[PDB]
C-alpha cells in the first residue's frame, strides 16, 4: 500500500480509466458511491 | 497547544478522454447533475474516517461551468480550497485532489450563476485514499 501522496503523483501524471481501475482494484482508492452524497441546489 | 491546521494546496489537472469518462459515468444516474440557468449546485463529500485525501473528476457536455472546492469544519467554519473559476470541462475531463486538513465535509460547487440562457449537464466522480 503506497502513501497517499504517491497515489496522487501517479494519477496527476499518468491519469486514465485504466490507471484508475488498477488503483481501485488494489484498494488504493475507494469510490464514494454518488447515491450517498447530499446534493444541494440554489439560485 | 491548539494550532490552526496548515491547509495543503490542492492539485488540479486534465486528461483528454472525455467521451469515455461520460460514458462510464452515464452508467449511473446519480452521477449526472442538471444545473439550471443562474443555478449553483453543491455536492457534499464528508471526510471518511479512514481517508487521507479526496479525489474528484468532472466534465460537462457543451459548455464551461464554474468549479470551486470548499471545506466545512464539523455557523461552521468554511475554508476556500479551490477558488471558484470557470473551466472548459466540456473540452476535457477536469480532475484534482486535496489532502484532508482534518475531519469535516468538502463542498464541490458547480456554479452556473453567470449563465442566463443555458442549463448544464455535469458528470462527476469522487474517490478517497487512506
Residue numbers in the entry:
A (entry chain B): 16 to 58
B (entry chain A): 363 to 436, 473 to 528
Describing publication, verbatim:
ACBD3 is a Golgi resident protein involved in the maintenance of the Golgi structure and regulation of intracellular trafficking between the endoplasmic reticulum and the Golgi. However, in enterovirus-infected cells, the ACBD3 GOLD domain interacts preferentially with viral non-structural 3A proteins, which causes re-localization of ACBD3 to the sites of virus replication. In this study, we present a structural, biochemical, and biological characterization of the complexes composed of human ACBD3 and the 3A proteins of four representative enteroviruses. The crystal structures revealed the details of the ACBD3-3A interaction, the 3A-3A interaction causing the assembly of the ACBD3-3A heterotetramers, the interaction between the ACBD3-3A complex and the lipid bilayer, and the roles of these interactions in facilitation of enterovirus replication.
For this analysis, we chose the GOLD: EVD68 3A complex because we resolved its structure at the highest resolution. It contains four secondary elements: two alpha helices P193A-V293A (α13A) and Q323A-K413A (α23A), and two beta strands I443A-I463A (β13A) and V533A-I583A (β23A). All these segments contribute to the GOLD: 3A interaction mediated through multiple hydrophobic interactions and hydrogen bonds. The strand β13A interacts with the strand K518ACBD3-R528ACBD3 of the ACBD3 GOLD domain, while the strand β23A binds to the strand V402ACBD3-P408ACBD3, both in the antiparallel orientation. The dissociation constants of the GOLD: enterovirus 3A complexes ranged approximately from 1 μM (EVD68 and RVB14) to 15 μM (EVA71).
